[PDB]
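Objective 1.3, modelling of assemblies. Example input:
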Amino acid sequence: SIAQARKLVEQLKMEANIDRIKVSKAAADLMAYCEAHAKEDPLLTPVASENPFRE
Amino acid sequence: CTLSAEDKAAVERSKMIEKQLQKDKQVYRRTLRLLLLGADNSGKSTIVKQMRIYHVKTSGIFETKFQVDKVNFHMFDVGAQRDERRKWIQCFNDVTAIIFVVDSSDRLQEALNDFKSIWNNRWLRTISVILFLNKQDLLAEKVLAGKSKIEDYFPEFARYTTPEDATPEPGEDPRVTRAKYFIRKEFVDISTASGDGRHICYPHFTCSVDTENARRIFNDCKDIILQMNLREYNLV
Amino acid sequence: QVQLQESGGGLVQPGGSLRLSCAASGFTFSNYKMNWVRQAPGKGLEWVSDISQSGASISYTGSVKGRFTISRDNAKNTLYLQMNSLKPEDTAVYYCARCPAPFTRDCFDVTSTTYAYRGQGTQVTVSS
Amino acid sequence: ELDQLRQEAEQLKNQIRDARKACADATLSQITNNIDPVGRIQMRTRRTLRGHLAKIYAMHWGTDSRLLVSASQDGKLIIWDSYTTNKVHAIPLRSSWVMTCAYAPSGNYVACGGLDNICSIYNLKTREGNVRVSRELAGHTGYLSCCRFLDDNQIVTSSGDTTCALWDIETGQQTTTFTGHTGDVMSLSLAPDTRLFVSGACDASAKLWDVREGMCRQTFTGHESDINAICFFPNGNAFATGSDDATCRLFDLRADQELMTYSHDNIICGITSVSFSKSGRLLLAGYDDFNCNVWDALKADRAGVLAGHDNRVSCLGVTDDGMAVATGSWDSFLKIWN
Amino acid sequence: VQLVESGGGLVQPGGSRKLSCSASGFAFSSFGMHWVRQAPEKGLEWVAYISSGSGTIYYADTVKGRFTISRDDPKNTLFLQMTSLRSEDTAMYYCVRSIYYYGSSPFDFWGQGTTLTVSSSSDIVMTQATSSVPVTPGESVSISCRSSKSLLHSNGNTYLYWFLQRPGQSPQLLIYRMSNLASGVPDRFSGSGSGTAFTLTISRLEAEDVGVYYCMQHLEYPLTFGAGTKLEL
Amino acid sequence: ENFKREFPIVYLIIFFWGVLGNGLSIYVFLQPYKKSTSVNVFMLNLAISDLLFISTLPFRADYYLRGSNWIFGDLACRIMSYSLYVNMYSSIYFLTVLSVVRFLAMVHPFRLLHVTSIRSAWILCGIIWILIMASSIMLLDYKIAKLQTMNYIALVVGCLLPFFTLSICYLLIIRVLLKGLRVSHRKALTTIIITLIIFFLCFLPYHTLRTVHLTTWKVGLCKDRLHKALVITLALAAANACFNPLLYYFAGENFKDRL
Ligand SMILES: CCCCCCCCCCCCC/C=C/[C@@H](O)[C@H](CO)NC(=O)CCCCCCCCCCCCCCC
Ligand SMILES: CC(C)CCC[C@@H](C)[C@H]1CC[C@H]2[C@@H]3CC=C4C[C@@H](O)CC[C@]4(C)[C@H]3CC[C@]12C
Ligand SMILES: CC(C)CCC[C@@H](C)[C@H]1CC[C@H]2[C@@H]3CC=C4C[C@@H](O)CC[C@]4(C)[C@H]3CC[C@]12C
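Predicted structure (tokens):
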């Protein structure tokens, strides 16, 4: 069990000493990606004429 | 018509596939699928040996086939899985008759908790359990000629006073019958406490030399089928 | 993250009254059927007490019938185990375990050699 | 003695929580309060694929957004046309307890695996007629939960032995073994560029992995119960977790903490599957209460319900071009929606 | 993965001929089976068809009701009878298999089918360009063909094939449905089209890329061909 | 010559309750479930038979209310009467085949002789429907016609034979249920015995009374009890369409699952 505590603490070092971009950036990035691809999501803006699953 | 010749022969392919799917559906519904549960002390492997006489290193599930009276049974012993079982147990919601094997001679409250957790589990309700109260012989020697008692680990056994037994084995001592009934009652209390009608538990008193364990699955199985047919033919 | 920190434990005499506790954080407490499980030395985990979601249904192992009492203050997120007349055999390390899933009445594999919503545990000792 | 190391691990937890808290002064919703709601999303069962005898654990789309593989506990891999409802192939399995299926991104292969601990690779586009087994990948000690092809020769298989494993299909030998989770691993999601993959397990934790060496980059722990399904956002800088505490949550890798939880009080059953659409505005989650809910991934409210299944929804999938979602279910029927 | 046949040779203009086939190399009972016949100093001609799970048995318009294409899934044989043999139906017979499902490549591997000889209509037409076009290696040929009826179903695909043959051995598929290359065909062969007339482009015409470039449509069942353009060195 | 007794309201009540009990049933049988097996084909057949019968009911109700009203209508009188009382003899056979299916399921469950929903079930539907129609198209014509021998041969096979088949099937099922008792066996026994009694009620009382005088009272004499009881059979036959929804598929779970 001592080696298990060893390998957990080694890992918990890594997630601690890793960089984090502030949440504002990530929220803005996801929102910008959603804006970028909205016009071509055929489930959100339903297909106009070309959808292959009619009738 | 409005589809080409390629689409035509594609549809002939899909239909030829339906023919095989129907043959397999005829195979798949005439077979009864049993999930066999149990612990390390339970004679689970010996029961599997019993049906094999009646009938690949890290294998994650085992699978034995036996037939009783021209009815194919298909028993799924669990192999190299981990201790936790709340996920891989969901794979067996549509089986007939979980076959639960317990060590009667005792750890027994662990078996009671296993039964209670199988019984009350969503996705495992509507499945009728078939208790095999195993190791009955060991229970006989443990009670009739032993210092170990059921009064401890189970205080409500001193004030038990066996119900009117129907027809025990002639050689069974009154104390043997008393304990043998107390353990079965202990399981049936869980069985009847929450599984209203879509559930039955079919307790049995089985041993390592018990050569009727296959038939006692057939009869229970037959009766589990009958209840399903009663609900689906609207007859109840 | 799902935390379950036990309290209590010690060197009560064979007959003393020792109260366990269990701080819980990281889950909405009220929705889970929690447990008490203990590990006597040289043996696997055994299940002890089985308080329900709201404090209604309660179960015990036979060996602690009458002797042990379980309560839970869902407002204080805390599980409890009142141990009385501690006979000199239940000297186990005592884990505060939890139901795998909410809104459920059964507890699969709570006494698993591996289970994840269990606790660190506390130790009870007797004879001194 | 040993308690010193465990206390230092607790201190590492405290510092990690402090860092994750300090990198957040505004929730996702504040940043996306002014974005226009998606309105009501209505999707109708265009096709219904029937032919599976028993419940369906997994479906995987092809990359052509037209072919589709589904696995069922009768022990069939069936490959569908999903434009027409034709059955392209119907593969019988040696183990009828398959929990997962995958379709190779080339379209050449399918792997199923399941409760037998082996990932069987099936060759579809053989010069010969029938679909035969490429090989079986036998190195896991618990049931296979998920499996995803990286290419024709690399497949990432998740297992109930708490470890994910990267395989080399030519040799049949584990190229890498990922060994962080304590509870067994239930779902798997390759990154858009296949450099990473997230992994949700029965310890209520999701781990971001680096599939170059086999070490865990990040661990995300926000859920209450065990995590049943994961899926990267189309971006690759986020992922959604479908858990058993009746919630879905969106985690992002770069900030490395939870962004929103998609929950409603009426839901008290677990999530079985998650999927985004194409722009990641529309998270689709399958439930145990028999019907998929469509979640506005940026508002955190329901918009649309895919209620057409008699039993629990066991799998989901959006096409690579995003035209359709297919939902398998324990009633043994696949439905394509639009 | 071989297809071989039996019988064949001299025949009378009213003699019964049992032209069998043998297929002992693949999953026989998952494949559609056509027959295609080569008139000796001419092009090659479509004949009977029998789909997987014999349930669609189409025929030509010149032999319709004479020779009863059959099947034997156990023995892996295409038994054929024939008795009429109208003095000009004698030719070189080919046994092409084809599997039909989305993305599949039909008309992939052909047999040999010996050359028995006699001892004495709203179909489509696949007309091709000059039948020789002599070109030396290294040059990019662009031999084409013409379809009377537009080979473009509302699916979105053109049902035009492209075959090559050699002085000797049987033909092969190069590019099925006018774009998609076959299995063992070099990436030098290609294809592009508009709907009724269009071409395949080769680049590095080596010593084995020489032969007659036949062509097929697959919208209706005359399954027509052309005279074939024989590229010379 | 004994029909001048207009006891109208009964027909209208039966029409209301039967149509509400049967439209719901066809609607919920119309749901795309993997239903149970080929057992809802038979109940669908019975439901549509009952629907068409109860649909024919209002116009003969008008006839028996206003004696001269229906004869005004059109040529349809003969087709209506003759080839729409094909329903009753077909509705009988559908309930008797349903009873045979139930007997096979309950008493002999390890013999899968009730399968094939698509078509080894609808083949029986087509056989019964078309065979009954064809056996009826030999004598297409209320207003009486010479049907002396017609009733007798219809009774020996189309009336009593299902009785000796339905009764035996349900009795053989009852033998099983006698020896979980309480929850299942008692509720199956109640449903079975109620179905048996109500079937014996209507059907037998319309048939025997219609035969006797297909032998006595239009070729001879009668008195008020006979043809009034005669109304009993017509009314009770009608009455059934009201119970057929509640009888076979009110206490069942299969059915109550859908709605
Ligand atoms: C399906 C497999 C096996 C074959 C099927 C057997 C057929 C089952 C249905 C029977 C035949 C076709 C349907 C025929 C209907 C009429 O036949 C009609 C009974 O509905 N006539 C009589 O009852 C005649 C009875 C005579 C008694 C007269 C009293 C009143 C009854 C109505 C007629 C009154 C006659 C009026 C005074 C002359
Ligand atoms: C007897 C009268 C009322 C009609 C008889 C019913 C007819 C439809 C036939 C058709 C299906 C038949 C069954 C076929 C299966 C068998 C064989 C054996 O298991 C005993 C009888 C049994 C169970 C038959 C019962 C008789 C049966 C039910
Ligand atoms: C549903 C039934 C009515 C089908 C029609 C005929 C009935 C009479 C037939 C069908 C098959 C028959 C039963 C099945 C076989 C047995 C076992 C043995 O004891 C001989 C008679 C007996 C007990 C039969 C009694 C009559 C039976 C029930």
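The radius of gyration of chain C is 14 Å.
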